[PDB]
Structures are given as C-alpha cells and as structure tokens.
Design an enzyme around this catalytic site. Sequence first.
Site, PDB file in Angstrom:
ATOM      1  N   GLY A   1       0.900  -3.083   4.914  1.00 48.16           N
ATOM      2  CA  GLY A   1       0.908  -4.448   5.438  1.00 48.16           C
ATOM      3  C   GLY A   1       2.334  -4.901   5.707  1.00 48.16           C
TER       4      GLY A   1
ATOM      5  N   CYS B   1       0.775  -1.217   0.000  1.00 49.87           N
ATOM      6  CA  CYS B   1       0.000   0.000   0.000  1.00 49.87           C
ATOM      7  C   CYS B   1       0.817   1.282   0.000  1.00 49.87           C
ATOM      8  CB  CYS B   1      -0.981  -0.001   1.188  1.00 49.87           C
ATOM      9  SG  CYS B   1      -2.155  -1.465   1.086  1.00 49.87           S
TER      10      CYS B   1
ATOM     11  N   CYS C   1      -0.824   3.386   5.750  1.00 48.97           N
ATOM     12  CA  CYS C   1      -0.375   2.273   6.597  1.00 48.97           C
ATOM     13  C   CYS C   1       0.098   1.226   5.600  1.00 48.97           C
ATOM     14  CB  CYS C   1      -1.442   1.871   7.588  1.00 48.97           C
ATOM     15  SG  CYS C   1      -2.913   1.006   7.059  1.00 48.97           S
TER      16      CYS C   1
ATOM     17  N   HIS D   1      -9.509   1.305  -2.960  1.00 44.57           N
ATOM     18  CA  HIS D   1      -8.063   1.225  -2.611  1.00 44.57           C
ATOM     19  C   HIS D   1      -7.254   0.330  -3.514  1.00 44.57           C
ATOM     20  CE1 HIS D   1      -4.750   0.934  -0.077  1.00 44.57           C
ATOM     21  NE2 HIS D   1      -5.207   0.177   0.888  1.00 44.57           N
TER      22      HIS D   1
END
Lengths: 389, 389, 389, 389
Positions: free
Chosen positions: A377, A86, A375, A345
Amino acid sequence: SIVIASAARTAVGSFNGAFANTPAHELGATVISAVLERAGVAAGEVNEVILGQVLPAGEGQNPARQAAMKAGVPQEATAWGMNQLCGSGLRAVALGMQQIATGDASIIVAGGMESMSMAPHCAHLRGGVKMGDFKMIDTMIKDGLTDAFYGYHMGTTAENVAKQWQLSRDEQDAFAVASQNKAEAAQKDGRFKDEIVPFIVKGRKGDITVDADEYIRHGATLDSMAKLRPAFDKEGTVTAGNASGLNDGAAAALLMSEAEASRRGIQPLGRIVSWATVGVDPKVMGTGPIPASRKALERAGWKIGDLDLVEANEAFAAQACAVNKDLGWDPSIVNVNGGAIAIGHPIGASGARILNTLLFEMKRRGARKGLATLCIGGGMGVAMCIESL
Amino acid sequence: SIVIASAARTAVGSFNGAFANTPAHELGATVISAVLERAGVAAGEVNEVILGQVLPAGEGQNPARQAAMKAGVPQEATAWGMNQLCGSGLRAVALGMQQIATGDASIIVAGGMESMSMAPHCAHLRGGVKMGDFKMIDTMIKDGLTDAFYGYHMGTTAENVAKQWQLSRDEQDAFAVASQNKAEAAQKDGRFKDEIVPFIVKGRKGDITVDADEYIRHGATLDSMAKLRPAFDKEGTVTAGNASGLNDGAAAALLMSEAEASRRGIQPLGRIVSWATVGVDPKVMGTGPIPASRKALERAGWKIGDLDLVEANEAFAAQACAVNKDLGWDPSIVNVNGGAIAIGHPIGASGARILNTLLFEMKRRGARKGLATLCIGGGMGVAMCIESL
Amino acid sequence: SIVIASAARTAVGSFNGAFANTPAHELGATVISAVLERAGVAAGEVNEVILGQVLPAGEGQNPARQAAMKAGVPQEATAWGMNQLCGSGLRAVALGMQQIATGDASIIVAGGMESMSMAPHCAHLRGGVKMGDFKMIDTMIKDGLTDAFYGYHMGTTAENVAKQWQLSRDEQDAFAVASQNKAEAAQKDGRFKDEIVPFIVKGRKGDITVDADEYIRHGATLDSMAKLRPAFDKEGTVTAGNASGLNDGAAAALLMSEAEASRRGIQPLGRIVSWATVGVDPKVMGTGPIPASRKALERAGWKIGDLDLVEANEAFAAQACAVNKDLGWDPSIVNVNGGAIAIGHPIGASGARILNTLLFEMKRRGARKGLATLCIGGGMGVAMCIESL
Amino acid sequence: SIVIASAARTAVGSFNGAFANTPAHELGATVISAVLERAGVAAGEVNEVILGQVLPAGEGQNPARQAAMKAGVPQEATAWGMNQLCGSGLRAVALGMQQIATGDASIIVAGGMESMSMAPHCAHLRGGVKMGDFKMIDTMIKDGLTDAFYGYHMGTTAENVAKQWQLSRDEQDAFAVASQNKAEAAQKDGRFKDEIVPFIVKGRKGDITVDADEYIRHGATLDSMAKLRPAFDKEGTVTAGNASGLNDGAAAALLMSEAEASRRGIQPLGRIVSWATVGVDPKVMGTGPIPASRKALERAGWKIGDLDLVEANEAFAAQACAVNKDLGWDPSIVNVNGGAIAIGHPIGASGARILNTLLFEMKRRGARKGLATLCIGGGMGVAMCIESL
Ligand SMILES: CC(C)(COP(=O)(O)OP(=O)(O)OC[C@H]1O[C@@H](n2cnc3c(N)ncnc32)[C@H](O)[C@@H]1OP(=O)(O)O)[C@@H](O)C(=O)NCCC(=O)NCCS
Ligand SMILES: CC(C)(COP(=O)(O)OP(=O)(O)OC[C@H]1O[C@@H](n2cnc3c(N)ncnc32)[C@H](O)[C@@H]1OP(=O)(O)O)[C@@H](O)C(=O)NCCC(=O)NCCS
Ligand SMILES: CC(C)(COP(=O)(O)OP(=O)(O)OC[C@H]1O[C@@H](n2cnc3c(N)ncnc32)[C@H](O)[C@@H]1OP(=O)(O)O)[C@@H](O)C(=O)NCCC(=O)NCCS
Ligand SMILES: CC(C)(COP(=O)(O)OP(=O)(O)OC[C@H]1O[C@@H](n2cnc3c(N)ncnc32)[C@H](O)[C@@H]1OP(=O)(O)O)[C@@H](O)C(=O)NCCC(=O)NCCS
C-alpha cells in the site's frame, strides 16, 4: 554469501478466530524458537531479531524485543520492528541479510508478525473534547488498510487495477477459486506441515494447539463466489471472496553467511541472491510487484524464464492477475499451494509467510531458482530471489 | 565510503505545545526537503526514505511514505518506518548507510520523526466488554515509555541506575542545570540555527513559523530544581527537571557514497566510520550507550581519547552521569550545546536530532572525530562514529 | 392547600466554568439545605426529595438520593429523579405538590439539578466492534439536545419556529440583547441575591464561593450580536448569541400544605394554584408554552390579563418571541430580570430556576399572580400558576 | 377510585440476549400498544405516558416520549421518565394514579422499561486527560447497581443482609432453586401468556418473535447451585445463582378512574387501594420492602393476613428471605409463579413487571387482595395494595 539456514511460520489464523486474543509477539516468540531449533542454533548465538509489524498499537514497547526475550534470545542481543506495510515481512529478511553482509552481525532472525485481531481502536484525546461526538479509530483500517493519500481502502486500489487491466469479475472469481482449491489441496497433502510450527493458544479452560491454516475454505464453489456483493465499490468487482482476508500470524528465517552454515553442518533452505524494492502510483499499488520483481531479477542476473517457482502475494485477485499477466511467468509455478486469498494475509508477517512457503516448496520439489514478491500500500513493491544449494 | 552530505532537524517542540496538533510526517516532510535543498539534490534522485518513529498509531498507512510524498520525493522511490525506540532515529541512518554499502541504493534520506502530542489513547474492543469498566490506554506511555518486561516506566529504570551508580539527587540536579544553561547558551549565540529548519505550523487564524527549541528553559535555577518532587519513585531521586521531556520533532540526514558527494561538488558533514548496537539488562537500559559506544569505537579503530566531540542522549540525568562516569570521556566535549533534558526528547526522532547537533557542532568548531549514542528502552544501546572530511 | 414555603437556587454556572467538575447532586445538596434553612424546617422533617435531572449518566445511583443524603435528609425519607427534559425542574414541583395533595407526604423538597459540564461521552461496547471506527457520543448532545424523531438539534426546532412565525434575525437579536441588559441590570441591583444561595466549590488550592450568575454578559452590544454566524442552519437565523447556553446549576422549593405553613408561622412565597403540561409537534417544540400556559390559566380560572408577572423560559429568542406574540401578555411583565439567554440553561434545573426568579420578584414588587412556563424537546410545554398570600 | 384497566409486559430477556440490541423504548412501545389493545382504549385517548427507566444513557431525548410516539399516542399528549431505581416500574404506576387522583389526567399509561444490555460505557472527557490511562465506566454497574454512599455492589448490601439475618448459603440456594422450579412450572403450564405480549425483534436476516421468558432455567439443581463461587465477597454467600440477573424488558398498566372504566364497560384487573414508599439504611437496602409494605397495608386498612397473593421482588435470595422472615406472610402465597432470580431483573421495569405478574395471577385464581413490593438501592422500598373488582 548470505543464506537462509532455516525457517518457520505459525499457521495463519482467521480474524477474531484462533489467535483473536494472542499478542503478535507471542506468535513471534514461537517462530523465533522454531527457526532456532530447526537449524540447531542456540538463542544465545542470536545477534539481532528484526520483525516487520504494521499494527503494534498497545502491545507495549517494541514487540520485536518482547518476542526475542520471550523466545530466550539473551538481553545482550538487539531487536527492532519495521514497517513497509505488506512488504514488511519480506523486507525484514533483506535488511537482516544486509546486517551480515556489512559485517555488523553474524546470525539474525528476521520475518514479520501481526495480530490484526488485537489491533485497538484509538482517539487523540489530550486536548479534551469540549462538545460533540468524536471518532474512536480502528487502527487496523486506518493504519494498515487505508491509502493515506486518497483516503480510500486498498480494495479501491484493487478496483483501479481491475478497471485499468480490464479484469472482469469472472476472471477475478476464477483466480480466487483456484487459489482456494490449490491451498486446500496442499493442506490435505501435508504440504504446509514442514513450514508450520504449531502454536499453543494458552487457555484457562484448556490449551489449544493450532497447527493448520484455519482460513482456507474447503470446497470453495464458483457459484458461492459469484453470488457475493462487491466490498468496496458498490457496483464494483472486488469481493470478500476474491480479496485476501484480515488475519493473524508470524513467520521468520534464520540468516547467516553460507560459510557459517557450512561450519555448522546446516543444509540451508536457500541463498539470498538478490532483493529489490521500487515505488509506483499509490492508486494502483497492486502493480508494485512488476517493477520490483524485474529489478530483483536484474540484480540477480536472472531472466523471468529462469524461475522454477514463484510466490507473488494475493492481496486481491485483480492485482494478482495483472501481475501474472504483465510478467508472463508460467501460472503453473506461481502460488502452487494457494495464496493469501485462501491462506490469509497477516499484514506485517505476509512477506515472511510467503518466503516460508516458497522455501519449503523449493526443497520438496527440488526447484533451484525461486522468487517471492508482494505489492505494498502507498504504491510500492518488494521482491526477493532465492537459489537452492 | 558513505557520507552524510547534509542534514536538518526541526526545532523540538514541548508536549502539546507548538506541534501539539501536527502529525509527525508533516514535520518529516519539512526536514526531508531541507536536506535536499541544503545539499542541492533533487527530490527525484532519492531512492528511499527511512524514518524511525515509535508512535504512529492513528497517523494512517506508513507515515514514512506520507512524509516522502509530501516533500516531493516521487512515487518511484520507496519509504519505510522502523522502531528501535529511542535508538530509532540514529539506527535509521545506519540502515540507510547499509542500503548504499550493499549497492541497493545511491541516495537515502534517513532519520526519524515523532509526535508525542498526537499519540492517541486506545483499547482493544473487537471482542467487546460484556460488563465492567475498562482502561483507555495512553499509547505514548504504554508503547513508548513503559518497560514491557517489568511494567514500570523508563523513569524507574533510571532510578535503578541511580541507586546502582550511587548518583545522588544533587548530582543529577547539577547535571540538569548545566544542560539547561548550556542549551540556553547555545540557543542565545545562534548555535542551533544551521541545524534547524523553520517549520510552518499551518494555522487558520494565523500561520506560525517555529524555528526555536521551545522546551529549553531560560535561567534555570538549582533552587527550583531541588524543590521538585520525584516523578516515578515516591521517595526517589529522578524528577521532571532532571529527566528528559515529552516532545515533538523530526530530524534527518542525506546520505550518499563519498565519491557521489564528490561528483556533485557537495562538502559532506562527515563520513560514517562505524556504528553499533548492543543489548543490556532492561532494568538498567540507561547503561545502553556504554557497550554500544565502545563497540562503535572498536569497529572504527578509535580510542575513547580520539573523540573530539560527543553527543550522548540525556534520557535521564542519572543515566547520562553513569554513561560519562563509566566511559570516562572528557565531560567538556559531551553535549556541549545542552542535551535532551533541556532540548527535548521526541523519542523516534532524537537519535537523528543529536546527530544534527553533533554534525553542525563538528563543522563549526572544526572537530574531526565525533560519536553520537543513545540508551534504548528494553535494554539496548546504539552508537555511531563520524569523521569530518 | 399547597404552598411553596421557601425556595432557593445556586447561581448558574457557565459551560466548563465555575462548576466544571461539580457533580449535580453537590449543587442539589446545597439548595436542599438552603430551602430548609430558609423555611425554619429541619431536614429530619422532609418526607421526600424529587429532582428533575436529564443527564445524570456517570454520577452513580439515583443522584436525587445522593443530594438528599448529603443534605442531612434522614435515610427514612425517600428520593427520586425525573426527566421531562427542560420542563423537569418545574414538573418536579407539580409532582411534589401532588404527593401532599393525595396525602402521601407532608413535606417535600422538589426542583431540578443539572451538570451539563459533567455529562460524559459514551458508547455501547458490550457486543464489541469487530472492525471499523465507532462514535463516542456526547450524552449532553444526544440525550439532552437532539430531537429523537427528526435527528436534529433543539436549535433547528428554533429555526422551524423562526421561519413559521417570520421572526427576523434582527428581532431575535433585539430580544437577546434586551435579555442580557435586563439580567445585567437585575444582577447589579442585587435582584438575584435573595434567590441565590452561594455554592462553595471545594478546591485543593483554595475553596471558591460562587454567588453570581457568571454567564450574564455585561455590556452586550447589538453590533456584536449581529456579526455572529448561525449556529445550526448555515444560512439560518439562530446564533450562539440569541440562543440559551449550556449551563450548570440547581434550584428547588420546599413544599407543604398551607395549613401546615400556618401552624409553623411561615409566610410562604406563594400558593400553587394550578399547573399543566401539554404536547405540540416536536418540530416546533418551542411553542410548547402556548397550550400549557393557556391550560394552566384555565385550570386556575384566570385570564391572561390577570397575570402580574411571568417567567417564560428563553430556550431560544425565536421561540420566546413566538410564545409572547401568540399569548399576547404584556411583554414588560415577562422575564423582568432577564431570562435564560443571559442567565443560562441547566436543562433539568431550569424550571425550578425560573420558579425561584418568579417567586422572589413577586415578593419583591408585591405581584399577586404569576406564571412560569417552559418549552420541552420532543414537543411539550409545562406551566404553573402561583398566587401570593 | 383509580383502577388498572389492563396491563402487559414483554417476556424478560437475558443479558445481551434476545433483546441485546433493542433499545428500551422499542419494548416500551409494544407494551404501550398492548395495554391499549387489551382495554379497548385507543392511543388517541391517552393523556400521559410515565415510564420508569434507570439507564437511558445514549438512547436519545426522553425515551418515554419515543416509546409513546412509536405506539401512536398523539403528539398532544405528554411523557416523561423517572427513576427510583428498582422500584421505578411500580412508582410510576403510583405516580400515574396520582395524576388521575388530582384531576390532571383521565387516561394514563404507566410502568417501566429497561435495557441493561444497551447501557453504555462512558467517561467525562470535556476537560481532557493530559496523560495517563483513564477509565471507561460501565453505566449499568455505576449508575444502576453500585451504592453511591458505600461504593460497593448491590450484592454486598445483600451480604450485609445475609450476616445480620444469619441467612446461610444453604437457605439462599434452596430459595433460589424453588424460585426456578415454580417459574419453570408456571412457564410450562402457560401462566405467563396472559401477561406477556410478544415482541418482534426486527431482523435483517429474519424477524424473531420473542414470547417467552428466556432467563428461566429449566431443570435447576441444588448441586450445581451449591458449587457456585461467591460473586461479591470472596468468602461470602451470594452467588450468581441466588442473585437476580442482568436483564431486558418493559411492562406497563393502563389507568383510569373506576367510574370511567364502568362507563366504558371494562372489567379492570384491580383497584389501587394504596401505595407507600419508605427509606432504610443504604447498607441493608434489601430490607426496604419491610417498612414500605407495612405502610402500604396500614394505608389500605389491611392486616398482613388479609393478603391473598404477594409479589415481593427477588433482588437477592438473602434479602428475599429476610423480607419474608420479618413480614411473616405465608410463603405459599408469595411469588407463586417464581420471581426475579428466575425470570430476570430489568431494573426500571421490574416493579411493573411484578405488578403484571401479580395482576394476572389474582385474576386467574380469584385472589381479592394482593401486594407488590420491591427493595431499592440507596436504602428504600416501594409497595402497592391491589384489590379485585
Ligand atoms: C474484503 C473485506 C473488506 C471483507 O471484510 P468483511 O465484510 O468483514 O468480510 P467477511 O469475511 O465478513 O465477508 C462476508 C461474508 O462473505 C463470505 N465469504 C468470504 N469468502 C467467501 C468464499 N470464497 N465463498 C463464499 N463465501 C465467502 C464470508 O463467509 C461471510 O459470510 P457471512 O456474511 O455469512 O459471515 C476484508 O477481508 C478486507 O479488507 N480484506 C483485506 C484487504 C486488504 O486490503 N488487505 C491488505 C492488502 S493490500
Ligand atoms: C517527568 C515526567 C513524568 C513529568 O511529567 P508531568 O508531571 O506531566 O510534567 P510537568 O511538566 O507537568 O511537571 C510538573 C511541573 O514541573 C515543573 N518543572 C519542570 N522542570 C522544571 C525545572 N527545571 N525547574 C522548575 N520547575 C520545573 C513544570 O514547570 C511544572 O510546573 P507546574 O506543576 O506549575 O505545571 C515526564 O517528563 C516524562 O515521563 N518524561 C520523559 C521521560 C522518559 O522516559 N523519556 C523516554 C526516555 S528513555
Ligand atoms: C448555541 C450553541 C450551539 C453555541 O455553542 P458553541 O458554538 O460551542 O458556543 P460558544 O459559547 O462557543 O459561542 C461561540 C462564540 O459566540 C460568542 N457569543 C455568544 N453570545 C454572544 C453575544 N451575545 N455577543 C457576542 N458574542 C457572543 C461567544 O463569546 C464565542 O466567542 P468565541 O468564538 O471568541 O469563543 C450552544 O449554546 C447551544 O446548543 N445552546 C443552546 C442549547 C439548547 O438547545 N438547549 C436546550 C434548549 S431546548
Ligand atoms: C451476580 C452477577 C455478578 C453474575 O454476573 P456474571 O458473573 O457475569 O454472571 P454469569 O451469569 O455469567 O455467571 C453465572 C455463572 O454461573 C452459572 N449459573 C448461574 N445460575 C446458575 C444456577 N442457578 N445453577 C447453575 N449454574 C448457574 C452461569 O451459567 C455462569 O456459568 P458460566 O460462567 O460457565 O457461563 C450478576 O448477574 C449480577 O450482578 N446480578 C445482580 C442483580 C442486581 O444487583 N440487581 C439490582 C439488584 S438491587
């Protein structure tokens, strides 16, 4: 020293929706051309194209390079992809800024691109399977949304954060609705139009131009939100409604030194004042933006209070609330036109997508200091500080 | 300014051979811990891990992070993967160098990892196939060895260079045998031992320590070479014997400012004096290294003749001869210990593999200036100049 | 009335062994041809070819027809496959007998064929998988060896029999080893030669003639049997050693009226005096033979004690002991040349395979009355009585 | 001697239509139940279930048994599948007839079932695929509709028939359209309700009762038929409109001796007077019905002109026309309620589907003599003569 001359993003498609059969590089192509046209820079002047992309399985060699050529960047330029999950989309831009900062390049196009729709299923079958069933793996779930250390989905990481921060279902549901409402508002008002470059879905039985984020839900209710079942934890709190979605899209920026922009007559969208990346526990990967945002501010010499506008990605309502709560920034200047829960997203592209939103909103409202954060992963955060000129 | 404090690589395995069922991040982990150990730096002091890897499909979220965590690098640091095809591995070192150069980090572990063996077959099946047969795609071939613009294999691109540079079969064959003899010669004299870090193939019915490049062929004969049939062009000149192989492997370098190395009492393998990346026609991608090496040399302020040692990746015999022919550097100082035709070509890791060989050879023969370079699919080249201290 | 004029079977191949890539119709073709030849009967006189086959997926349209056509059976004749699982091969002969009985045919070739090695992996993908992994089902396991009502393997039905009849591991192992030793003895004395017709595995780098059962184990030891672990119930009693195997092969018989055999001067292998098929609980499917054998005998007007020889398929030691125990026939007249634990078990072919074994040993030793019986997944048995002439 | 005491069929579903995800055995169970109910026969009195089915891959062990057990037929009874491609459904009823004929059973349930929609894609992967792309084979196409000798679709055998009998595109389309219009009118008048037993498609979000042939097109026009492109031969004559479809359904008949039905007071749907099966040239498979129908008529001792009603399957308009031209029967008594171009062609079931149709319509108009015939891939035909009581 380094500025964002221009920027553009495609609209965000819903999963197996408007971009269901469109390869990410196609979406990228269009964004590369848009950033080029929007700043008056010729593809021929592009030194390199950097594109964050998490799931390129089966799209062929280096989709970043395919995107760049499709858009017309000459074969003498270079192109590559990169993956910080991300944070990919935002990291790309940083990385591109460093290219100019170290004098290795003059003009760079950077951002992300992703076709979650087009991610294939796979299996390692070189040895052969003598007997018994085998799994055909969904690379979207395995390579983009599953924690590799705990084997569970990002939604579970979100549940970990909810519990830890004591964020109730109602409070995560309240946040989601607001996100939808703000995104819907912004859409109606023409707020997404500058940043969106329409994409042409090349058809057979007709072409379809997409120029609106199709995942945003109009008239989202709190009642419908509260009736949904938990998606990851059977007696959990995270739902399809208070979690971002699975989506496709692309977004990017044209970077060059402030001087160069100046020589060209280009009025930049902003000056990259600083950026930061920091790790955290994978189990609570949603807390990522806390340390990263603070690091970035530190590097910029800014105080949280100095920010006029913030874009903190909405992976999940629980993580978004925890971030806001911790940082204490004024809710009112965060995701002013909605966030990922409403907009969608597209993993590799989301950092560049939110950068576009931040940048066009800072120009339209005249804000001076902005920050975009996401944020990541595996337990990481990424943040970028931008100052208008 | 930025120096490579230490480095390490695993042995390069053959396709479906010793590393056949070893996921790239396991080899990555080993190499990252080696580089730390070797320099005397604790895992805790690493800011970020940058790993080029072209074929992660099926390995799970960001394998770069999985390598880092497995190797002991705390959850606080960060990690990311990147793809520039065969230039990945070398490129990553340059990107880490820039992390330090811009003051965003102090210590980076950079390089590449790859498991060609573990690359899966895939198919996009979300839309379903209503009627009719469909193809299961080999992702190593599609995403790693097939030109996305002409749809043919890198081998054909080699054929294009062959014809263009009028490089006969016998001349490529000659080149290949020499690389084998030189790779075998160096292996026999223990010349690859400093660079290699043994890798433990965790077994069930026995654990196996791999510490030798298994792909090198002992006693390669010209007669056997000349009887092989063309692999890509039916009446072609490129064969399995004069082309690189399908392999597994991981390589990395530990980077830090020169001053930091000095503060720690480390003896650096060399200082990164410059690097470069330039594009060329995808059809003759093998020429990649010509424009990139020159550029690198230009940025370093060095002449071709200043180079004491050179490592120019052996994608294909055809391309390697063309590179050397054009550049004109003295053949005896290029791939002194053999190349990828004999050693192997784990795509994402090769650029860091050839840096390791360059770096440990430069220290062993006391050469001062060196240059590593690789051709990249899609038409690109990457080059790096290293000077000892 | 109806006699078996001649019969033939191919040697039984081991799983992914001699016949690893041979489609079942090829093996069927050779057996069709052998039976013709053996009876002095021309392929143009066949009216219909009937072949059990449980796993023909991927072989193309009706493989029974492909076998018949390959054998030279005229396009005017007809062909069809049938599936009654492990009783298929024997059921066909019964169904061929009835074609003649009711006057709709004069000359039938009937038997079974099966390539368990060539059975494919499959998936229903018409609807598409929107997300999540899916299984690639082994058709061999799913359609051939898994009970459709309880979801477990045929081996678990073996375990249910083991328990219910209190057959220890030791007794099962004793049975398996005597199977091996007897089949080995019959192989070495040339007992399987009249019944096998040699199969030529068409190669590229050489043709291989297969004329020996390759699964029979020479020198099988009780100590090796007893150290094997349970294959289906972790603390079970059924093992790989005491269970049948996964195998390939074909077998058949040429049928006609007794009066027609006599007009041709043929000395037939036997007269089909009766047959029967009866169901039992699927959980103990292995008990099938009991009621089917008892029913056939009754229809024949025979007592168990009138039988001179018996072939009772060895699906599993446990079920074979149970059938013998219940039935009470003299064990020394049962599977005198070994059975399926040793020879193998090509599901669709096995009923015809054991009917060849019966026929050729009743001729050899001058046995007058014989019976062949097999247990069928899903809870069924099939039996047939044969009388020499 | 053997009568059809009752019969039933489901409505025929469209390809991936109403029974898109309904395994064939589920539809067969409902037809099993329905024949039983229709005749006053309890499931405990059934001795054997024989169901033709061409594409069972992936459904589990012997779907004929699964259907029988679902319907409540006792575990003491038996069941099997058979495959004679498109005449399977009818062959089965001849086969069930033979069991009673020879005294081996008293009560049989026979017919066919198929779900083309549930047929999977497969690959033989036991040996492994070292490298390269491989094919995922549509089993419906490969095992159900391609000729095994010539490697082309059943539709190209249709083209062969068209040229050889000189059947123009126009003639084909007009038969197609007349098929649609007679099926629409018998649908609309209620002539399909006696034969059809409603199927409940088990929902989650609602159970759906399917009781109407959904493939039937209402308002079919000559003009839109005439505009269709050839589907198999780019410059052919067979199109989607004049060819049967891809469908789902099941169909059966309950058999017993005429004496037995009289002891129970059952007024049977007819007497089975004869059947015949005959082969022809695979390239003109569509002509199969010609020799098969003459053969059945000769065994019945009937002249073509004695027939009152005929059901001759519509594989393709071209073969349908060929069969009618040669036999010369009055067209007005053939498929009086439409045929397969309109109703659908679930391969394993079709023979039984058209017998139901035949049966019910012979009852309603008081036809005394009828015949059902079908063309079979691989070069064959099956036909049966029925006489009312
Ligand atoms: C949450 C998640 C698992 C949902 O997947 P899914 O079950 O296939 O999602 P769906 O959209 O089908 O949700 C089911 C339903 O909820 C409904 N829904 C979703 N949001 C809603 C809202 N705001 N109001 C009302 N209904 C809503 C959908 O309309 C759908 O209705 P339907 O069942 O009639 O089709 C998936 O979106 C996901 O993994 N998301 C991203 C998570 C992530 O980790 N991203 C990376 C960041 S770290
Ligand atoms: C050339 C290539 C297609 C070969 O694939 P392959 O056909 O599966 O290779 P194999 O190893 O099976 O070659 C077949 C045979 O060549 C033999 N062979 C290879 N090198 C040999 C040599 N130097 N002397 C003698 N025999 C040799 C092998 O031993 C083998 O013998 P066998 O048939 O008994 O097994 C493959 O190596 C390839 O694509 N390589 C990499 C090229 C590339 O594009 N890399 C990316 C860089 S841009
Ligand atoms: C029992 C079964 C599951 C075994 O499958 P598997 O585990 O893949 O079988 P294998 O052949 O690998 O058996 C494993 C091992 O046992 C060994 N073995 C088998 N029989 C042996 C014997 N008699 N003595 C010594 N070793 C023996 C094999 O040689 C092998 O040795 P390895 O591990 O060194 O390779 C399989 O044969 C099976 O399902 N069989 C019967 C099938 C069935 O249900 N058919 C229909 C009946 S209704
Ligand atoms: C003929 C065949 C390939 C068509 O498959 P397909 O091309 O995927 O089929 P479709 O039904 O999608 O195509 C028909 C197209 O013409 C249209 N069409 C069909 N019949 C029509 C009619 N009577 N009038 C007008 N349009 C019609 C369909 O609506 C569709 O239109 P669309 O694509 O705009 O939706 C397939 O149905 C077939 O293979 N049938 C064979 C049966 C067979 O061989 N059976 C065993 C025989 S021995």
